[PDB]
Design a protein around this nucleic acid. Structure first.
Ligand SMILES: C[S@@+](CC[C@H](N)C(=O)[O-])C[C@H]1O[C@@H](n2cnc3c(N)ncnc32)[C@H](O)[C@@H]1O
Lengths: 106, 82, 328, 94, 76, 98, 98, 87, 107, 94
DNA sequence: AGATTCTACCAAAAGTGTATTTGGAAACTGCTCCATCAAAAGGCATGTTCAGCTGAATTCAGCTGAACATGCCTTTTGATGGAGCAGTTTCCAAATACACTTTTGGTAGAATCT
DNA sequence: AGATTCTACCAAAAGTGTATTTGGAAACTGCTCCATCAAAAGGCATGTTCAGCTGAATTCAGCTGAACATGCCTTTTGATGGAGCAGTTTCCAAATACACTTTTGGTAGAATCT
């Protein structure tokens, strides 16, 4: 037997996503492709954030992604920032940003 | 020397929050205003968290009770479960 | 009477019919006239000196009478130029390239003289290989300045439209051949005529044109798959052609071998794409994507430039990613 | 009692994207929250879509429309292509 | 029986195969050392596409012959 | 006696706190505040440790972002000093007062 | 010839419109804007008349409420005249551009 | 079906007096000349966003007609719940 | 026979509410008291809004409640205003409210 | 196809509070939106609540907690009394 | 200190096989209501004139906040009994499932009210 | 003109009546991890001094409101073709429903690694 994930060429668990959809009371029935499509979407979004987060760890001279890096990756990316516009990443801090009028008159 | 709890949120702690928020100069009246605002924030979130605690027949407020409370208040928090 | 403007190198004159053809309230025959003469006086000083006489400089676009004096002197000037050039004076060479300002006038006339009803070109349903997107003189110019077309290239414009991108490029540059194929019935019919008006006029100003054929054909045809492989400059309009249309094209681009360039209205994969073959849709894994300079000649309904992207095939990057893992 | 999370799958993806990059516990917990959050938003939107159209079934089509409604421009386009690709691949397999 | 497998970066990787080896084993040998996926790997020789499950004798792959590895993409 | 001009150190602190992520309110006092508020809704409650921390991470992120809006309001009025009316304007527009 | 002072009629207009509920943008022009925008998203769409009225009721409520916030921003700056920067600050605090 | 006039520049149908009226209902007494264009730009974004989602619901249902319900659902999704139109 | 609404002393339809709860996919099961409790709450909130809107109508010398009356009722009531804080009542208009600094004169 | 609405029930309640007051169709449409809106809000809060507690049943207890979470102070108090009373009565009648 | 590697245990899942059940697509079509053309006209949009008074600039002094040095009390950290959060077992009140029987909210059409 | 007033039709509800199933309250209990205490530990409170910010007072260019003349285009009233939404019946591709075999992710403990 081959896992539905492998058949779909995915790392995320199709079987689990199907199960979670069924028990989440979203609809009376859940078609076969739904959990595959959804798993693929979750995998892709995950790759996107880890891709940018990893880059932030790199720029910071770090090999391990910590919350700060996820925050920097999300807030510096226009689209991810909007998707997560009402989300707070614990231990994320904020982007360095000082309003120009506050700087000394060099 | 005694101390009202909300006063435990000190002027220096408030100034640090303000600094992370990009604030350069602060009016003396800001501290009390901030305390009032923070209390309202906590009252709203804690009230809901405790409502979930009681519904679950528990005596202990869990992180999940807080996460669910924050989420319904439009303040979704990542990192503590859910 | 008609209005003729006698070729400045005696080859295939321009003829404008009587009564005057009005296309819309922004193009009439006369306005084309005025610009043609304007440019010929600027190409050859001796004619400019002569156009001053016999014209009071009171001529106008909407009266014939006013035009008939302007043509008559001009035609009289052209007879003087050929006698001048028949003696010891040297004439102009027909191996010259047109300038930007002149070239703009030549493409504009050729459109107007073919297209006598632009509304019909605007007929499209979106998410189809038939969207006639807004292509500008300026956009083709960014293309001509930024990547340089050589005799070791081949040009093919998939979804050509009238085909104004190919024709502009041929007047200015030269490749082994330049092609334009567009599937839509309406723009093709116009394109055939466009080729004719364009050839008649390039020889009229005495300027070398490159080899081109504007063809009635389908650009997504399976015939092109082997042709694309041999073509190393692809321009491909994709204003709102749809993802579906885009995907099929991504499969065919794979057939291109290194040094190819692909100019498209979108990235196929990010400018700042990470190398490692992961994509199951994008072919932009073997090619670097960078932005060609933003426009002001096209403006969408959003009111912000339409951006275009240059992709340059260098499979050297993907191969190197793998190489790094074999080291040390 | 088992406590399931997306941690192991997030890790597999991390290795595909950044082979020599690790992730702390707190960061992973954030990623788990992220996946659960997007799962719920997409699922809820798909749920509403089917109810609005009086359908008992959530199929790949409701997941697709949910994605286009929830994700910003480019993210939606790539998510849709990734989803379509996976269902194709999946459907073509004994 | 010696082979060179050429990428278009002008890198030739030598593999020590025998002619009894399938195309599928060879691509596995290329994957071992450069981390290259088999499906994305298209081995071409002499205008023939070397197809999986085929011995090397079949394509007249002998000692000190250069096979061309062209990539492609795929997925799906 | 060296002395930095008014504002120089403020700017220094902004740079420092915007680079870090640690909580800025001290834990115990925050915890006491939390328990006291909760006692008004239900007596004799306990708190998981992660529950108090989540409340603090959320409360601090809320105040920091509110201070950002407050700052834009003070600047809008051509000031560089935040005042209570700036926090009030921000909360009203956010709809927390409206 | 009689003249109300500047501001007098403006105040009268405020009282008049805050007393009524009819839509303030002309109907056909708003319907054309809706159709133009929709058409650029997808060709050949039709619209139920109540769908256009729903968009209009929502668009006007949105704009009236944004002008209230904008007004508060101008007043905050000691002005009585709303300006583009007030609308921008209001939208930024609301998270419409943040 | 023959022809169908081209729609362009209809944002200008949102006139200066209409915008002035909307600001009066919002309690505004004085208005800078730059406000009109700024408001048109803001209204266009608002409309593009709601119409995009509404049409997305229309297409999903495989209809060619945008319904009041497609708009109500789009408004609800955006946190602008509207009562009075079946929603 | 007797309706579940009569047994519960309600005007709102318990049967309907039970059905809507089942069709809405809120949970695998819905207990008998759920729709009763819910219908009761909906009925109570509607009594409250109509009480206030009819008063607004009376205040405006009208006998028929129109959207403007529903809006005046909701917006002039602190709790209903909050519950409907993100809701737009079509043809509701807004509450008369002119910021002080905008009024003429002084004192 | 028959399309339901709470109209007749809204009307019955209107008559109890204000006997001689009527309601226009547009206001009744607004009242029907209001009832559906609150029904969905309370039902959704109840659903999540039950899921959070791993319960497959929405009982009056979940509706009561949803009501407390959703309604402002004094309205929640009165809604709670009315619902409790309605259930106690309901259960006494059979 | 916290992330990684490894061995061992197993209920929970997830995948495969079998048979029944069913949602909703295509197919055909009734019928609402959407797009569109017409004609008339007055409610308003447009464009201009004129000047009231607002926003923007400039100047300046009181005084509030920032910076800082001085000193101790509240917080942080690490260690330890139990308050209950959970895992397990038992058991029935109460919730599906299913067949009738009866009641009722819609609603199509015409008529008079308010 | 829009609303509350009746007549007749009724399928879809809602309700009444047995059989069968089972979710989760209830009781007991083990294992966390929470509350609390002691002490090692790292800010905060407070008064002094003055830099520079806020806001008051003053001035004026010119924006923007008020009033007006003119007439365009939205609104209103109607009609009509027909696009297409939505009702009805047929009927399979795909989903639910077990039952059974296999694999797998999560948990617990031990110990090394970064
Ligand atoms: C935006 S128009 C091109 C205008 C012109 N190429 C320019 O750059 O101004 C895109 C053209 O693509 C053509 N097209 C789309 N799919 C096609 C296909 N499969 N084969 C050929 N032409 C296709 C359409 O008919 C359409 O005219």
């Amino acid at each position: 037997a081959k896992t539905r994930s492998s058949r779909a060429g995915l790392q995320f668990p199709v079987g689990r996503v199907h199960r979670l959809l069924r028990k989440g009371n979203y609809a009376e029935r859940v078609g076969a492709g739904a959990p595959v499509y959804l798993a693929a979407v979750l995998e892709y979004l995950t790759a996107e954030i880890l891709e940018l987060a990893g880059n932030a760890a790199r720029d910071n001279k770090k090999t391990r992604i910590i919350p700060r890096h996820l925050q920097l990756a999300v807030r510096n990316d226009e689209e991810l920032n909007k998707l997560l516009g009402r989300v707070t990443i614990a231990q994320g801090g904020v982007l360095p940003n000082i309003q120009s009028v506050l700087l000394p008159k060099k | 020397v005694l101390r009202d709890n909300i006063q435990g949120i000190t002027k220096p702690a408030i100034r640090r929050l303000a600094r992370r928020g990009g604030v350069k100069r602060i009016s003396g009246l800001i501290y009390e205003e901030t305390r009032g605002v923070l209390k309202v924030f906590l009252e709203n979130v804690i009230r809901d968290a405790v409502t979930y605690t009681e519904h679950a027949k528990r005596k202990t407020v869990t992180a999940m009770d807080v996460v669910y409370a924050l989420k319904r208040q439009g303040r979704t928090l990542y990192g503590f479960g859910g | 009477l008609e209005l003729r403007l006698k070729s400045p190198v005696g080859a295939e004159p321009a003829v404008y019919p009587w009564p005057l053809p009005v296309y819309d309230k922004h193009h009439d025959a006369a306005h084309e006239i005025i610009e043609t003469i304007r440019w010929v006086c600027e190409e050859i000083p001796d004619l400019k000196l002569a156009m001053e006489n016999y014209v009071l400089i009171d001529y106008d676009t909407k009266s014939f009478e006013s035009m008939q004096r302007l043509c008559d002197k001009y035609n009289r000037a052209i007879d003087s130029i050929h006698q001048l050039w028949k003696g010891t004076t040297q004439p102009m060479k027909l191996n010259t390239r047109p300038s930007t300002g002149l070239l703009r006038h030549i493409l504009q006339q050729v459109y107007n003289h073919s297209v006598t009803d632009p509304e019909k070109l605007n007929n499209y349903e979106p998410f189809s290989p038939e969207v006639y997107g807004e292509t500008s003189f300026d956009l083709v110019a960014q293309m001509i300045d930024e990547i340089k077309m050589t005799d070791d290239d081949l040009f093919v414009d998939l979804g050509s439209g009238v085909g104004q991108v190919v024709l502009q490029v041929a007047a200015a540059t030269n490749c082994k051949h330049h092609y334009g194929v567009e599937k839509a019935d309406i723009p093709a019919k116009y394109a055939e005529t466009m080729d004719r008006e364009f050839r008649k006029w390039m020889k009229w100003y005495g300027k070398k044109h490159a080899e081109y054929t504007l063809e009635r054909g389908d650009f997504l045809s399976e015939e092109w798959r082997e042709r694309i492989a041999n073509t190393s400059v692809i321009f491909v309009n994709n204003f709102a052609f749809g993802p579906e249309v885009d995907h099929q094209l991504k499969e065919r681009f794979a057939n291109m071998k290194e040094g190819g360039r692909i100019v498209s209205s979108k990235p196929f994969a990010p400018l700042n794409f990470r190398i490692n073959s992961r994509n199951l849709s994008d072919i932009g894994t073997i090619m670097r994507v960078v932005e060609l300079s933003p426009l002001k000649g096209s403006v969408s309904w959003t009111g912000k430039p339409v951006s275009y992207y240059l992709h340059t095939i260098d499979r050297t990057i993907l191969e190197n990613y793998f190489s790094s893992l074999k080291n040390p | 009692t088992r406590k399931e999370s997306y941690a192991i799958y997030v890790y597999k993806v991390l290795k595909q994207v950044h082979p020599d990059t690790g992730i702390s516990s707190k960061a992973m917990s954030i990623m788990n929250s992220f996946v659960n959050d997007v799962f719920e938003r997409i699922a809820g939107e798909a749920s509403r879509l089917a109810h609005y159209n009086k359908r008992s079934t959530i199929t790949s089509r409701e997941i697709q429309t949910a994605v286009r409604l929830l994700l910003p421009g480019e993210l939606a386009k790539h998510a849709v292509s990734e989803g379509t690709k996976a269902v194709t691949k999946y459907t073509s397999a004994k | 029986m010696q082979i060179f497998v050429k990428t278009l970066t002008g890198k030739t990787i030598t593999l020590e195969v025998e002619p009894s080896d399938t195309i599928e084993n060879v691509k596995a040998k290329i994957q071992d050392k450069e981390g290259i996926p088999p499906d994305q790997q298209r081995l071409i020789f002499a205008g023939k596409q070397l197809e999986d499950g085929r011995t090397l004798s079949d394509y007249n792959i002998q000692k000190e012959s250069t096979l061309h590895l062209v990539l492609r993409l795929r997925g799906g | 006696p060296h002395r930095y001009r008014p504002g120089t150190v403020a700017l220094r602190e902004i740079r420092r706190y915007q680079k870090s992520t640690e909580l800025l309110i001290r834990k115990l006092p925050f915890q006491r505040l939390v328990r006291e508020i909760a006692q008004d809704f239900k007596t004799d409650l306990r708190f998981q440790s992660s529950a108090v921390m989540a409340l603090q991470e959320a409360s601090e992120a809320y105040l920091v972002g509110l201070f950002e809006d407050t700052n834009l309001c003070a600047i809008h009025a051509k000031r560089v000093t935040i005042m209570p009316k700036d926090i009030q304007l921000a909360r009203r527009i956010r709809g927390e007062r409206a």
